[PDB]
Design a protein around this ligand. Structure first.
Ligand code: ADP
Ligand code: MG
Lengths: 250, 56, 471, 470
């Protein structure tokens, strides 16, 4: 009818188990892990029905967020591989990242979006283009920097920037924030304006920055939300500097 | 200074030897589990194949 | 009245042929009562439960006792209703089997008492309640990292010989004595010695005056082990619904239910599942678990022990149960061997009540910090094993130093363990636990030896133990 | 008379009973065209392919579409021949399904057009070419480090973000421009949105005018997913045989072709293979691949994107597929991020054509020296890491200096993407690639900035770009 729909499947593994049970009860010949053949066809048929219709069809769209639950973090199992081979990407969650203080525990290295770039506004794209490189460098260096003692200047700067970015990326439950404020905060992070802020103070810095933007610089937010693009760089830089001056570093 | 350099080299040698011994012990303890998992995988695969054959 | 005839006998599965147009419904109870015609026969008093309709007026049933002595052609009577179990105020202080016949040698149940069918549908969506409130247990690790919930489902996973029974006994000793409601114990597939000891324990403690028990232990055929859980659950449901009481439900090794199901499934004629289990593993377990819920009329809080075969946490039977529980404690043989009791995993264990708005901001922060430092210590294990402590950075030394003491302090001495060690035991309030762990995290007790934290309880006992040792 | 009846419907598999002495042959096509008799029945237009002869005048078939609505007792007609798809110039610029029916909005193919059977024996021993020949692609990386054998099979590896579609379009453009041959694309069992995006990209770039596409994406039943590749193969075979020209055949994913057969095998009623696949996996793959061969007149060379589930290279489907490949090209996201298009990995890519008696001794020596220098640079990057911050001998500096120039010269501008960047693009002959890389190795241009070697084409383009930069 020309509207936009979002569909969430709580668990496709439960559906797969139920279908396997039904097929076994119907005395159909089992296959790998007793799963009947066409177990891939079932999920492909289900998920392929979500699409972005063209203009002639009305322009409606249906997007799906299937869920798959793994055992002991094994992503190479039968059903996880079958589902991964169908969708346009995957968001991977890890227990070690969950308990290391990182929520929502997104694994940036193993996550990917095959529609990325086109699914972002101009400001978000031009601000977050380099964040993947930043996180890749941070993880690669941190994999051994705790004992390597290389202590090169570039490596130290990259480690500090990556730690600050990781601290920035954390979030609280049921606390959504507007895309304009996200654009501004990752802009401040990437431009290096918070490079002198302590890591433990980074989160309070972000909260105070949101509060400060709630009062001053509101025209930047209006411009972003009206034009889907970054404001003038100099005005944003001077507003960031003003907030940094009025911020109390602990 | 010369005595300190000699001591440093000897200490590094001893530490590396201990590390190699620990690595070898870890290797054998892992090979045991590898053998167990290999047997389990073979058993599961043959059981699945035979069950599928019997289903017909 | 209509009667049947035995066609096939294959272990605990019996085929019965009936007259046309008078087949019994599924889950009905059938009775076989035979008198020895000659010297080459034996007397039989056995009951069956209908499972499948095979066609041509044939029914496949499951026996609740040993099938030895059955002869092709015996007469079968249809009761016309599922297994009916006596329920009400009569059941308090008694011990029953799967069929509902008392086995305490304390008299016989009157023949006109109310009896309920053992099978019933689950409560509807709109009849449920979702209130969350903490159930204090007195165990440091449980109260800190995975609080229990009143009216919720609690599972205790563990391998063979890890301490599930000890933890169950400690929880009973800490909660059931002062609960003030009604307790039900169902010992499906467990030791008859354990059942006898627990019965004598409640008899000594006087708690038996407000509890009912159904055992159906491991020596029974799979038919009894498949239904004793429902036999206990129907009494629990009656007490929840009719009288609106608060009910404690204890189940030992609910995994035995699915194990007996898998044992029977092969003879019923079903295709094997992944690792030999029944195809209907998920639905059969769901139909049982979903009946143990808290509704508007009453609340049922259930503590269930779950067995992990061969310490494989990815086995389908333990893996499917995880979706039905609210708070889970995962026991570990690795921690058990080191001497930590209870050997519960501080990271694998989870609870739905661990939220800042439920347990408190300070509690949540302390728990998160403890989990973070334990995770870091776990990560450093490979480097520790390969190179040793010498290569750790300055702060990693501190992380290990704090983490070892935290792990040792997570242990506790139990009241039920006094008879085996002589330690009187302890009951640590949650406020004391939080204060002690916060003090440990702040570095107040960094000088004390780690052995002082082993099996004490309160934080002051650590100082007393260290001073006794000579610090 | 010559009609059949449906007796069993079990998912994609349908059993049909015929009269005695009128059984259809294997691989024949059967049509079910039933009209609604009342409101309790629905209309059906379905095509079935004969698979087995079960005896008692019954035949087991696999459906090409959904079997919902089938009723035991429906009438089935026999076409007397396997599925036939149109061939010729009419297929260029069009989009077809597995049945040869156009799925774009343009007009239908006239009923008098020539149609050819899908199933065909491979060309025999006496007809094949007696020597190896090299397909000149015009891309420096491919023509140097991994030549494409004319008539051979090439495996392509790479995910999203890299320029896989750009590389495909450039290959089609270069081949049609220089060798005068068309290309054919077969979308076997992949993402529908990705297929649509590729179609729109080709239409925008204008390459669509010299290609034909068949789509069997993963929403289709296994019956269509098995046969889409064969329909594309027949469409290419027409141009190989009649027109006698070298053509290109792209397959979106060859693993789905085996997966569909594995899915249908159990319902057909065969015992399971090692990992649940069909027992006929090897022979099916061979009968598909062996028709892609070079003959006396014309040839077909195939670029096959291969997906390895969970990177398990021991899986039977990749194991069977790899036995037919002649070359390999890996696309590197690291190179794509660094900006070295086509982002083809210079070390992971391999080809059996890189032999002194095939490409020439000079070509082999230049390629081997380039590979050695790049391996040394990769080692020296690690050596720069883990302490040793730019503390290395003179030869290390020299080889790094040469390696950066080589790596940047591997980049090339394309005829496509000139609508995004005003550079017209270039077609660089293999002799020019070899000469330019030899000059770079010899140090003729070692004093130039490395930025001048990016997106140049010929060797001179570097010197004019540097002169323009100043
Ligand atoms: N708190 C504790 N203190 C000392 N020993 C314990 C404690 N908890 C469990 N154990 C040990 O565990 C054993 C009992 O394990 P049990 O619970 O019977 O295993 P399962 O969980 O298989 O039933 C005893 O031998 C006892 O030594
Ligand atoms: Mg026990």
């Amino acid at each position: 009818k020309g509207k936009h729909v979002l569909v969430v499947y709580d668990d496709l593994s439960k559906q797969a188990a139920a279908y396997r049970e039904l097929s076994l009860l119907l005395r159909r010949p089992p296959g790998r892990e007793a799963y009947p053949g066409d177990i891939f066809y079932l999920h492909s048929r289900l998920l392929e029905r979500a699409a972005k219709l063209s203009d002639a069809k009305g322009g409606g769209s249906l997007t799906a967020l299937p869920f798959v639950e793994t055992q002991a973090g094994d992503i190479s199992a039968y059903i996880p591989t079958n589902v991964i081979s169908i969708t346009d990407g995957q968001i991977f969650l890890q227990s070690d990242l969950f308990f290391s203080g990182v929520r929502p525990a997104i694994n940036a290295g193993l996550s990917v979006s095959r529609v990325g770039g086109a699914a972002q506004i101009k400001a978000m794209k031009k601000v977050a283009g380099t964040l993947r490189l930043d996180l890749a460098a941070y993880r690669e260096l941190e994999a051994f920097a705790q004992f390597g003692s290389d202590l090169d200047k570039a490596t130290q700067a990259k480690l500090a920037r990556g730690a600050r970015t990781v601290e920035v990326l954390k979030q609280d439950l049921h606390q959504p924030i507007p895309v304009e404020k996200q654009v501004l905060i990752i802009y401040a992070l990437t431009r290096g304006f918070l490079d002198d802020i302590p890591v433990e103070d980074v989160r309070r810095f972000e909260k105070e920055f949101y509060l400060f933007l709630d009062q001053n610089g509101q025209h930047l937010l209006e411009h972003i939300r009206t034009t889907k693009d970054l404001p003038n760089e100099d005005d944003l830089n001077k507003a960031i500097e003003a907030f940094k001056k009025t911020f109390v570093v602990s | 200074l010369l005595d300190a350099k000699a001591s440093e080299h000897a200490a590094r040698m001893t530490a590396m030897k201990n590390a190699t011994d620990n690595a070898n012990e870890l290797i054998r303890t892992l090979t045991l589990s590898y053998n167990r998992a290999r047997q389990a995988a073979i058993t599961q695969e043959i059981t699945e194949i035979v069950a599928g054959a019997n289903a017909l | 009245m209509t009667r049947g005839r035995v066609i096939q006998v294959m272990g605990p599965v019996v085929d019965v042929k009936f007259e046309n147009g008078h087949l019994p419904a599924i889950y009905n109870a059938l009775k076989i009562q035979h008198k020895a015609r000659n010297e080459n026969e034996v007397d039989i008093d056995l009951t069956l439960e209908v499972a499948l309709h095979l066609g041509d007026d044939t029914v496949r049933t499951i026996a609740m006792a040993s099938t030895d002595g059955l002869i092709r052609g015996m007469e079968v009577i249809d009761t016309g209703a599922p297994i009916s179990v006596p329920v009400g105020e009569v059941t308090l202080g008694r011990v029953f089997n799967v069929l509902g016949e008392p086995i305490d040698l304390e008299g016989d149940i009157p023949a006109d008492a109310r009896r309920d069918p053992i099978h019933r549908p689950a409560p509807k969506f709109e009849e449920l309640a979702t209130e969350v409130e903490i159930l204090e247990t007195g165990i440091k690790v449980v109260d800190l990292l995975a609080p229990y919930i009143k009216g919720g489902k609690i599972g205790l996973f563990g391998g063979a010989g890890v301490g599930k029974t000890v933890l169950i006994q400690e929880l009973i000793h800490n909660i059931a004595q002062e609960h003030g409601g009604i307790s039900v114990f169902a010992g499906v597939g467990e030791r008859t010695r354990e059942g006898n000891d627990l019965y004598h324990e409640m008899k000594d403690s006087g708690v038996i005056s407000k509890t009912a028990m159904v055992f159906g232990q491991m020596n029974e055929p799979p038919g009894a082990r498949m239904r004793v859980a429902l036999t206990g659950l129907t009494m629990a449901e009656y007490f929840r619904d009719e009288q609106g009481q608060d009910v404690l439900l204890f189940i030992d090794n609910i995994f035995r239910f699915t194990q007996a199901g898998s044992e029977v499934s092969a003879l019923l004629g079903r295709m094997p599942s992944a690792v030999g289990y029944q195809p209907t593993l998920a639905t059969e377990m769901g139909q049982l678990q979903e009946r143990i819920t808290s509704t508007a009329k009453g609340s049922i809080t259930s503590i269930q022990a779950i067995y992990v075969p061969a310490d494989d946490y990815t086995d389908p039977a333990p893996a499917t149960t995880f979706s039905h529980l609210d708070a889970t404690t995962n026991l570990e043989r690795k921690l058990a061997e080191m001497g930590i009791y209870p050997a519960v995993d501080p990271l694998a264990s989870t609870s739905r009540a661990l939220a800042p708005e439920i347990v408190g901001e300070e509690h949540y922060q302390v728990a998160r910090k403890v989990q973070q430092t334990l995770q870091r210590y776990k990560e450093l294990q490979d480097i520790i094993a390969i190179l040793g402590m010498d290569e750790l950075s300055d702060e990693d030394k501190l992380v290990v130093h704090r983490a070892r003491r935290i792990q040792f302090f997570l242990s506790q001495n139990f009241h039920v363990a006094e008879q085996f060690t002589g330690q009187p035991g302890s009951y640590v309030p949650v406020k004391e636990t939080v204060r002690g762990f916060k003090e440990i995290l702040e570095g107040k007790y960094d000088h004390l030896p780690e052995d002082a934290f082993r099996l004490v309880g309160r934080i002051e006992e650590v100082v007393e133990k260290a001073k006794a040792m000579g610090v």
